């Protein structure tokens, strides 16, 4: 006979979803500014339309996205293997190989074959082909159903070949699907450990040992992936908010008056610009207002020089005596003004030059002759018990704000500073006023030394550890705490600062008013330095390195406050306990989740419908009644549903029965299916307007066998509502197979196909002694036994033949002794083919691939490569018919036992 698939079909294998990921350069010489590059491409095996998209980038023209160009690839005749994305291991499914005939008026007769694959259980075996001949009318298609059972997980391959009769046209498709284990994917949380190296762990490091995945529902021998998620937790180091600029709108003052009155109006405007420039609140305050106040600062410096005495000193009038405090305060305001506006520096250094020649006793004391007419501007220095030490600290701070600007001008400045610092240390431990210790606490922290005890007295004089307070007007205490903040920010201490700034903010002092010169200038110079130098966040910087015994390297991650790698995932397919070492500052979160295959119900099939399919031989060669009963599992009746009916090979439905079903009230069979020919009609869809949830809706129609076939593949019925194909239910029907399932032998989620023969079919007379030795001496033949059938345990799934090992002709990988028993398994379809009788003897050999259970309970399977030959008894050999066989068997044993197998 002719195998039409002899056409040497090279099946189509290339549904890439995308390709041609190429980069070309238009180097050809341009014609009218257009370069044309010709490019040879090899189209893939897909039968579809490709959309080719091109994007160009040019140095002189920029980016351009071309219009999509389409290429359609087609054949007249071709196979479309409708393969699902995934299939569960050992679950029986029906794939569809759709064959298309786009000939205009030629009806094709095609021979189509499903190729055998040991990874699947189908009608195709190693010794039998699943070939069939179908008819495809012109401009039509026919779906060829194939029933398979995947037997091993992974990417498995299905190949279908076809060749048409009387035309030299052939085609083949070779696609692949994923075989996923009977469980369902599930994820569990392994650990959630918070990382904080400065609160947990020791010596600055934190070691966290992670336990391996604690799964107990996992399907045996399945892959699991553990995902390590290192993620930094951002916080907002904490810093105290700046004062809202809306409360500071009243500090913009036009300076006027004499030498003391001009500085009163100049102070709130210089310190407001200084504080608003540092905090950058001009956007929320009015960017236009910045220049107007900048001119009022110039107006203050312009009118203050009118009262600068020719001796480089400052007094209220040009005829007034100079002051040590007023001169030192002009140095304090002009120094902080240089950063925004400047005109003359010899005015600032000229006042510092006079401040040391005339008002510096070698004791280091600054004494006030007091021509200060306005006692408002003095601040806490007024009404001070230790007015002598508080003034030495006030002038000393003024020299420092101008020290970096008058270092070369006034070369005697570091001498007076050291002398002023010497006087403060001596009588620092004798002060009893909180204002003196505060201003002289910033006067000795500024580029100076406060002794351990002096620092202790400075920190212990803070009542409630947050504020500096003393009997007197509160503007003295607000000024004092402002000096104590500039000291804590000069010493770079930040553990005592938060409660100090919080108190300053809760004071709600926004400057301005009568006698507020010192209080307004210091409270916003200190709060500006707090915003200038500050540790918005809490400084996240974690150096977390994980040491995994799964690899030979340690992966580390510097989790800065930088937003480049806030979280970084590390997948590790190996499930092993690893170590997480984390050190640094800040907080972080570690998440370890493992995905795995959890064993559950494979109960995921038929979760929305009940489906009962019965095939009965109720009475042109054969005629059976296919009955289908279905019921929806909801609280209400289901909507429009589909009955995807598949015919068993060789059968077609009765046309008159379908026309009567199509006339139903709640049923619809399309006119397309009713006009189809009787033959080449193996699929059918009966549409249901509704399917009840209370009772089973049953329909039935007769099916006729128009073509006799040796092997009948089970038909299938599939129910689903139109809006959800995933929620379906498929039942198989076949006269003479349990629930429509193909024959397979399963044990502990491991199945092997049982659609093979049954055994090696070579006749006992066509085999010779040399043919037995040549077959048995192959390395594939593991065991060669002489057995005696003891018991035949008949079962409906498979027959068990308990054999006593009469003689070990060739011992295999199974250490069995004479007298012991081994079970030989064969499906019930081979019960009549084997014809095994109890207490009879047999010669048996087979492959080591036919072993089944574990070594203590090892079972043998009688497959297509198992030799089973009747061994007649010694007395039976006296017949002339058995003479030939007994001479072979007796010689076969002596040749194997005494001399073995050469090579």
């Amino acid at each position: 006979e002719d195998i039409i698939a002899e056409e040497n079909i090279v099946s189509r294998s290339e549904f890439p979803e995308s390709w041609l990921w190429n980069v070309e350069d238009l180097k050809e010489p341009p014609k009218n500014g257009i370069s044309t590059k010709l490019m040879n491409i090899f189209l893939k095996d897909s039968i579809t339309t490709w959309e080719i998209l091109a994007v160009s980038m040019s140095d002189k023209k920029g980016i351009c996205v071309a219009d999509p160009f389409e290429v359609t690839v087609m054949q007249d005749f071709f196979i479309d293997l409708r393969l699902p994305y995934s299939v569960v291991r050992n679950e029986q499914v029906e794939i569809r190989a759709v064959l298309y005939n786009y000939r205009q008026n030629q009806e094709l007769k095609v021979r189509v074959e499903l190729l055998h694959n040991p990874a699947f259980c189908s009608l195709a075996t190693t010794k039998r082909r699943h070939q069939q001949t179908v008819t495809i009318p012109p401009k039509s298609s026919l779906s060829v159903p194939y029933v398979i059972v995947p037997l091993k997980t992974g990417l498995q391959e299905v190949e279908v070949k076809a060749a048409v009769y009387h035309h030299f046209i052939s085609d083949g498709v070779r696609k692949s699907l994923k075989v996923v284990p009977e469980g369902i994917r599930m994820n569990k949380t392994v650990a959630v450990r918070t990382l904080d190296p400065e609160r947990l762990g020791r010596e600055g490091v934190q070691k966290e040992d992670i336990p391996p995945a604690d799964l107990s529902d996992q399907v045996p021998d399945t892959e699991s992936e553990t995902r390590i998620l290192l993620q930094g937790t951002p916080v907002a180091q904490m810093t105290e908010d700046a004062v809202d600029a809306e409360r500071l709108k009243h500090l913009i003052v036009t300076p006027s008056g004499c030498g003391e009155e001009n500085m009163i109006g100049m102070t709130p405007t210089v310190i407001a610009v200084h504080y608003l420039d540092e905090t950058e609140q001009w956007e929320k305050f009015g960017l236009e207002k910045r220049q107007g106040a900048l001119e009022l600062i110039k107006k203050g410096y312009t009118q203050q020089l009118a009262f600068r005495q020719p001796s480089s000193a400052f007094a209220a009038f040009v005829k007034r005596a100079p002051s040590t405090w007023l001169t030192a305060y002009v140095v304090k305001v002009f120094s902080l003004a240089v950063n925004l506006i400047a005109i003359d520096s010899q005015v600032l250094c000229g006042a510092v030059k006079w401040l040391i020649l005339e008002k510096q006793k070698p004791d280091g004391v600054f004494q006030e002759d007091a021509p200060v007419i306005h006692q408002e501007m003095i601040g806490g220095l007024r009404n001070n018990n230790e007015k002598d030490m508080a003034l030495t600290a006030f002038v000393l701070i003024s020299l420092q704000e101008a020290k970096d600007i008058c270092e070369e001008q006034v070369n005697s400045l570091p001498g007076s500073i050291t002398k002023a610092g010497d006087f403060l240390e001596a009588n620092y431990m004798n002060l009893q006023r909180s204002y003196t210790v505060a201003i002289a606490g910033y006067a000795l922290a500024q580029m100076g030394r406060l002794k351990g005890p002096l620092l202790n007295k400075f920190l212990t004089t803070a009542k409630d550890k947050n504020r500096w307070e003393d009997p007197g007007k509160q503007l003295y205490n607000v000024e004092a705490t402002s000096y104590a903040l500039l000291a804590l920010l000069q010493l770079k201490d930040f553990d005592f600062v938060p409660p100090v700034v919080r108190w300053l903010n809760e004071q709600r002092y926004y400057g301005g008013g009568y006698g507020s010169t010192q209080a307004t200038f210091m409270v916003f110079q200190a709060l500006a330095q707090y915003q200038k130098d500050a540790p918005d966040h809490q400084e996240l910087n974690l150096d977390v390195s994980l040491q995994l015994p799964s690899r030979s390297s340690k992966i580390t991650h510097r989790i800065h406050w930088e937003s480049a790698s806030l979280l970084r995932s590390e997948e590790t397919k190996e499930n092993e306990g690893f170590t997480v070492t984390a050190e640094g500052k800040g907080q972080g979160t570690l998440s370890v989740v493992t995905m795995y295959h959890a064993k559950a119900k494979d109960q995921l099939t038929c979760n929305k419908f009940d489906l009962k399919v019965t095939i009965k031989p109720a009475p042109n060669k054969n005629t059976m009644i296919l009955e289908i009963c279905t019921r929806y599992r909801g609280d209400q009746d289901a909507t429009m549903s589909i009955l995807d009916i598949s015919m068993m090979t060789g059968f077609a439905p009765d046309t008159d029965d379908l026309k009567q079903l199509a006339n139903g009230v709640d049923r619809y069979i399309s006119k397309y299916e009713l006009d189809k020919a009787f033959s080449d009609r193996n699929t059918l869809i009966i549409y249901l307007d509704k399917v009840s949830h209370s009772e089973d809706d049953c329909l039935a129609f007769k099916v006729h066998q128009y073509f006799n076939v040796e092997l009948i593949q089970p038909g299938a019925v599939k129910v689903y509502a139109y809006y959800n194909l995933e929620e379906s239910c498929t039942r198989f029907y076949h006269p003479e197979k349990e629930d429509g399932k193909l024959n397979k032998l399963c044990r502990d989620e491991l199945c092997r196909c049982a659609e093979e023969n049954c055994f090696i079919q070579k006749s006992d007379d066509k085999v010779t002694l040399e043919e037995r030795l040549d077959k048995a001496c192959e390395p594939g033949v593991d065991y060669v036994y002489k057995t005696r059938l003891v018991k035949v345990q008949l079962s409906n799934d498979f027959d068990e033949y308990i054999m006593a090992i009469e003689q070990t002709i060739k011992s295999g990988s199974d250490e069995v002794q004479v007298g012991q028993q081994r079970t030989f398994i064969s499906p019930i379809k081979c019960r009549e083919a084997l014809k095994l009788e109890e207490k009879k003897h047999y010669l048996m050999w087979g492959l080591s691939s036919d072993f089944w259970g574990e070594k203590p309970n090892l079972s043998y399977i009688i497959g297509k490569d198992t030799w089973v030959e009747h061994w007649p008894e010694e007395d039976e050999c006296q017949d002339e018919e058995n003479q030939k066989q007994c001479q072979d068997l007796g010689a076969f044993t002596e040749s194997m036992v005494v001399f073995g197998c050469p090579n």
Partner: nanobody
Amino acid sequence: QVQLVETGGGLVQAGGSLRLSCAASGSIFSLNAMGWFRQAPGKEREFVATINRSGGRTYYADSVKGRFTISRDNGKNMVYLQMHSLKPEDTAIYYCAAGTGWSPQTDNEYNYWGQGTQVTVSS
């Protein structure tokens, strides 16, 4: 496209034999049908033999059914037609043609033909 060149023809006696070689322009691979056609003087162009793409299937006309043998070499881009046991009724111009595979026994599915060669079998 692809064109063909026929060689191997000539003059022969009544009883003898000769084989005709067909040379292809491009790669003959992936071409399903390769057929030989002949046209006798005073007669119409008739079908002779087709060969499969891989060479595993052939079709012959009843007049030359058991006397001609078509073969192809896809690696050499060649088609052959071994003519044995000649008859004086086989005198014709022999054409080599490329086909699509559909209906390989008719000329309506051959779009690329050759020059042809004269094979005169004298009585």
